[PDB]
Design an enzyme around this catalytic site. Structure first.
Site, PDB file in Angstrom:
ATOM      1  CD  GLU B 173      -2.933  -1.277   2.245  1.00 32.56           C
ATOM      2  OE1 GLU B 173      -2.585  -0.937   3.395  1.00 32.56           O
ATOM      3  OE2 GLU B 173      -4.094  -1.651   1.974  1.00 32.56           O
ATOM      4  CD  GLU B 418      -9.703  -6.702   8.339  1.00 34.00           C
ATOM      5  OE1 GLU B 418      -9.822  -5.982   7.333  1.00 34.00           O
ATOM      6  OE2 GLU B 418      -8.668  -7.360   8.578  1.00 34.00           O
ATOM      7  CD  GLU B 487      -6.000  -5.390   3.953  1.00 31.65           C
ATOM      8  OE1 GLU B 487      -6.902  -6.179   4.305  1.00 31.65           O
ATOM      9  OE2 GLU B 487      -6.233  -4.242   3.510  1.00 31.65           O
ATOM     10  CD  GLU B 505      -7.097  -2.144  -0.368  1.00 35.11           C
ATOM     11  OE1 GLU B 505      -6.538  -2.570   0.665  1.00 35.11           O
ATOM     12  OE2 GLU B 505      -8.011  -1.290  -0.351  1.00 35.11           O
ATOM     13  CD  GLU B 511      -7.614   1.106   2.605  1.00 35.91           C
ATOM     14  OE1 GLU B 511      -8.307   1.130   3.646  1.00 35.91           O
ATOM     15  OE2 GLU B 511      -6.903   0.125   2.287  1.00 35.91           O
TER      16      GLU B 511
HETATM   17 CA   LIG Z   1      -6.346  -2.043   2.972  1.00 27.65          CA
END
Ligand SMILES: [Ca+2]
Ligand SMILES: [Ca+2]
EC number: 3.2.1.3
Lengths: 717, 717
Positions: B173, B418, B487, B505, B511
């Site tokens: 990220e 999650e 993730e 992602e 985000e």
């Molecule tokens: Ca994330």
């Protein structure tokens, strides 16, 4: 100072914090120091230098990170609470019908000003020992934390004699060593023998339960109780000051416990008495565990006497593997129906049925079979992840036929779940595995964890694996399945909470008698150490003690006489008892086999007649719901002479007693199969002198006369 | 030496073993060096000195233990096999209806005398690149082995410009950096920004797909394909000789892969062309993956356009948690029905129903809801094991009513799993979690792994976790469930084999536009890097780019104009597309929202019109089973002027085109919401000049006229 006394006033525990606020305790027994002033506390892992909330903002006091690691001193006694508990409860299975839980308690709330947090240390003092644990209340200043090391001390008052095994994070299958505490360091090297998975941690580290004998006539046992959601405790000896200190098992990163308040550490126990027999009689470990959580346990949990296709593979006579022509196998790819049988696979339908026949003919409850499922070709030491699926049988193992046959014969098949230490793999397959058991008539399972743990980096006794072992037991309870876990962390009384955990090996068992042998005094020590906290699946009953008869290449010799093997069904307590030899060998000594057939598995009463660690243990037990008694004696290298007094029998009653003893000149090494069998009458006025040979012992069945037609032709022994 | 040429003769791969027996390869494109002589091979972990079989006997050659670690040189070519493959297949969902798999192959069998073992290196050369992998045949001398390091080199012919992110075992990220290979070292420190879980490994380490542009007009992409039963590959740069080398992700003990023959490494790819658009058009990654293994995939796997209760929590306007009055929670103990609602919990029935109303009114397929289940209070950074159960809803989330309501509106709810990176916990709950989804009408799930991995010691991209991610996808397939995993390890084309993996992602998504923002050129790079191997759930569609309007404490600003957000539905390919803003904001700009409503999710054809990494990307796609086209352009810091030629449209046909573009005064920072919408007629003779502002772009819907009445009043654009 705070003082706590046992109900009978014989033991006194004194507590106080020193001038730096370090919690300190001491214990005396009949005015003799048992535990010298010893400190209590823990060191916590330091928090990350930078830790941000989801909003990317660190709102912590970065000036107290170092201070927070201290949970060992700087304490003030904020409050104290006392209480007395005295209640009796009945175990589903055990050494006696009722257990009394009687203690005086002292709970000390300790406040640590520098970190604005408090903890509680709870002490419970029984007439036979002390138990203590740390409690961490939920509070603004203490929620999630990681333990770096626990620092619970046990200061000895002298250089005692100890019965110990090397401290290790992965195995407990070591022979015991008897030596002074000051001699441990020099003996550690040779005490650590080779094992498939082992991780020693100190030249003076030992495992618990640790047994000791003092020069002033005391017997001391150090152990723990209710090891749940925590890492296994070992002991590290400071051999200069003679202080033992808690040494927890690290995870893959070296940490020793992830905690979340409210939470507690397991209990730490000091069992003491001037009579060794009282150590065996102590129920402190069980009493400190939470009450049974299986509401309907009594309806399905039951003792099991069994035999099994096992010794074949252990000795090397047979194999777990189906074929020998593959360099490796891949489940779901390898087609076993196209492989050539090695001709040594013992787990085949015809052979299994022959064992079922024997079990049924002699009153056994179940038959264990190992090597029944695909994958055994690669079971040992490959650190293989997808090693077993626990449900696919080999081509020569007919699950349905074996189930139908066993059931018709009134026999239950015991499932075998060797995991080869591949734990994620087992958990992924667990529900399907337990369902398979349910769908095919299996209600008990022997699990195993041979090899280094996967996830790789973890040890057999860390918090991670302890969670797994209990997870397996709790899930098993949901399926009404009983569990016997080999290679798991040694027991700490959790069986009280989950009675379906009917066994563990978690110590050096009979299998090692085929790997070179166990020390002659081994079984005169296990009850004082390993058995404290739970039964052991020791798999006794070997009659042909020369392993070369099973496998010519195996020259190992069981260190025992036949009579001592019989005694183990009484001296090595367990609701799970195996007759480990092969059927044909028992058929060669059927007169002696009778004791194994007759002996009970559950008891209403137990009387420890004689007991001296490393030398001899003599026990008499009353079979549950009967008026029959069973006696057993196991002796060390020098044998033992017993002057038995049967005054524990009922007055005015007659008993048919059968004595299985070592014949004159019997000897574990030179003459192990020499035994005598005498049948006669016994009463509470009877007295008998019996001699257990070196590595020998004796067994006695004492059945109450029900019909006068039984005592015909019999004389008083 | 061996020579392999692409079907069009433009690429040439030369293979040879050097003087020391090290496999070496090189690659040229149109006579220009792409890869200089580079070696191939691996080093294996040394076997333990003392390893014994079950019989207590070591049967190994202790003299060979050292040479066996060598799997990089001392090789000799034993055999070579060539072949040509040319077949076309159709993806369930994709950028085009049919993909052609056409390559010339060279397989080299390499024998290593010193270890008496062989391996195979297979090369596949396409007109747009080279792919290679190592194969390890099952043999007497090579069965189980552990990889210490893989040594696959990629020697560059110069100090190219690279578009990269820091090599890291736990996160991807990061914003991209554009610099010379020689400048990476000095820029690494600043390139590594804070993240919940991150483990950089080198001052010159970067992740793949790595994108580069050479001074001699070439575009080179380095990546891998079919990352299965292996550790994720990163690249470590030798910035003195300009050589990239494979750097695998280590496990908790530092090892890089447990292998068992027969086995293969994933493919390593070098995609090259003198036209950047051809990098985007390459399907080498998908072509190197195994064919679809989900037989009935076409019957249930389907694209999904959705909205969700999400942005609320991301921006801080709302919370995932139900209450704020607890320092921590314990599932099964904490009674939420007795806790005080924090008044910020967005995942409540009434609010969810409003989202369903909006979704149904505007033609969306699903509604995602996060924060619906117990446990969110402790979801972030506590390394909590039992963090979620994935089945118990909060008191204010009525699962059944929401299901009934969604069904009535023709909407499907997207499940949210999650895990807070607690993997054993997720696996233990997986079957029940998927069954819960099936029982309550959820056929797609967005999973997450935020935080450091548990088992502690493992990284997000190691072999252990890669196994988990695929395990989750394969199990989901058995339940006919589609997976979108955040993730997780970045994609490598496995969607071909398991089409239910509709997203990841695994890169910096929208985000982060709320966490400070993404670089203006971010979306002009992702298609050249992250998208190679699979689609991304980028969650575009933010119209109110000022996050302070959602939460006054959040001053982050999305680096985009509204028109560019529309363009992303075409320039950021994915069969899974979210309209991420809240309904209220879309209602403020409903005219622009029309493009999001109209745009397709699956395509029969894709034409990359313009493409330059870091500057601009313009794509035209034909909606599957239609004659309609959709166009999108995304631009960087300097904007972009496009001279569009619609000759890809069908001759003789009329199209109703709607152009959504940046206003002449638009700017991502100073004037992001300025746009124009023009509706008119377009034909294959049409040509339009459009300008994308700084951080801007444009979108065009081109629908074929079905009824003349639809073109009334419209003029040619
Ligand atoms: Ca994330
Ligand atoms: Ca064992």
């Amino acid at each position: 100072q705070q003082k706590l006394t046992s109900p009978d006033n014989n033991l006194v525990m004194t507590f106080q914090v020193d001038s730096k606020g370090a919690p300190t305790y001491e214990l005396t027994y009949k005015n003799k120091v048992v535990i010298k002033p010893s400190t209590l506390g823990l060191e916590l892992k330091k928090e990350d230098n930078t830790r941000t909330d989801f909003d990317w903002v660190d709102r912590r006091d970065l000036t107290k990170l170092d201070s927070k690691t201290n949970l060992y001193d700087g304490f003030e006694v904020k409050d104290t609470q006392t209480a007395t508990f005295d209640e009796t409860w009945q175990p589903v299975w055990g050494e006696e019908k009722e257990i009394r839980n009687h203690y005086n308690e002292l709970a000390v709330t300790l406040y640590q000003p520098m970190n604005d947090r408090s903890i509680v240390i709870r002490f419970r003092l029984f007439n036979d020992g002390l138990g203590f644990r740390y409690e961490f209340p939920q509070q603004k200043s203490l929620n999630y934390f990681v333990i770096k090391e626990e620092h619970s001390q046990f200061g000895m008052n002298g250089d005692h004699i100890a019965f110990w095994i090397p401290g290790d994070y992965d195995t407990q299958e070591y022979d015991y060593t008897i030596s002074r505490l000051s001699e441990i360091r020099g003996l550690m090297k040779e005490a650590i023998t080779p094992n498939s998975s082992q991780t020693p941690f100190s030249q003076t580290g030992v495992q618990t339960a640790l047994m000791m004998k003092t020069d002033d006539g005391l017997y001391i046992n150090l152990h723990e109780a209710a090891l749940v959601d925590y890492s296994c405790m070992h002991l590290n000896l400071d051999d200069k000051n003679m202080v033992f200190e808690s040494w927890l098992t690290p995870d893959a990163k070296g940490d020793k416990g992830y905690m979340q308040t409210p939470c507690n550490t397991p209990w730490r126990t000091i069992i003491v008495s001037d009579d060794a027999r009282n150590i065996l009689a102590s129920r402190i470990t069980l009493n400190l565990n939470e009450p049974c959580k299986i509401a309907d346990a009594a309806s399905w949990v039951k003792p099991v006497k069994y035999i099994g296709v096992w010794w074949d593979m252990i000795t090397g006579k047979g194999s777990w593997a189906y074929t020998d022509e593959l360099t490796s196998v891949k489940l779901g790819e390898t087609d076993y129906s196209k492989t050539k049988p090695n001709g040594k696979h013992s787990a085949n339908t015809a052979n299994v049925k022959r064992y079922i026949d024997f079990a049924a003919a002699h009153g056994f409850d179940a038959v264990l079979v190992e090597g029944w499922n695909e994958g055994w070709e690669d079971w040992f030491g490959n650190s293989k992840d997808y090693v077993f699926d626990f449900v696919t049988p080999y081509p020569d193992f007919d699950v349905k036929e074996i189930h139908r046959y066993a059931a018709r014969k009134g026999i239950k098949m015991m499932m075998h779940h060797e995991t080869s230490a591949s734990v994620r793999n087992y958990e992924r397959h667990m529900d399907k595995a337990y369902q398979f058991m349910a769908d095919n008539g299996y209600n008990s399972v022997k699990s195993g964890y041979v090899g280094n743990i996967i996830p790789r980096g973890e040890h057999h006794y860390g918090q991670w694996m302890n969670n797994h072992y209990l997870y397996a037991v709790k899930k098993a309870a949901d399926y009404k399945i009983m569990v016997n876990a080999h290679e798991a962390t040694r027991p700490t009384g959790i069986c009280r909470t989950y009675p379906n955990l009917i066994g563990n090996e978690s110590a050096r068992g009979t299998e090692y008698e085929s790997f070179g042998g166990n020390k002659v005094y081994h079984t005169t020590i296990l009850p004082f150490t390993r058995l404290v906290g739970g039964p052991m699946d020791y798999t006794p009953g070997i009659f042909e003690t020369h392993c070369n008869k099973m496998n010519p290449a195996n020259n190992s010799q069981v260190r025992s006489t036949i009579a001592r093997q019989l005694a183990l069904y009484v001296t090595m307590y367990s609701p799970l008892q195996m007759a480990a030899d092969i059927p044909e060998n028992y058929e060669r000594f059927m007169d002696a086999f009778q004791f194994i057939k007759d002996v009970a598995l559950d008891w209403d009463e137990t009387n420890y007649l004689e007991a001296e660690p490393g030398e001899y243990i003599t026990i008499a037990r009353k079979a549950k719901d009967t008026d029959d008694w069973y006696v057993g004696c196991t002796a060390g290298e020098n044998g033992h002479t017993s002057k038995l007094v049967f005054d524990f029998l009922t007055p005015g009653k007659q008993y048919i007693a059968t004595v299985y003893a070592d014949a004159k000149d019997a000897d574990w090494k030179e003459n192990p199969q020499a035994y005598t069998i005498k049948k006669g009458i016994l009463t509470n006025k009877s007295k008998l002198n019996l001699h257990a040979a070196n590595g020998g012992g004796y067994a006695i069945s004492i059945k109450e006369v029900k019909d006068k037609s039984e005592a015909k032709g019999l004389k008083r022994l």
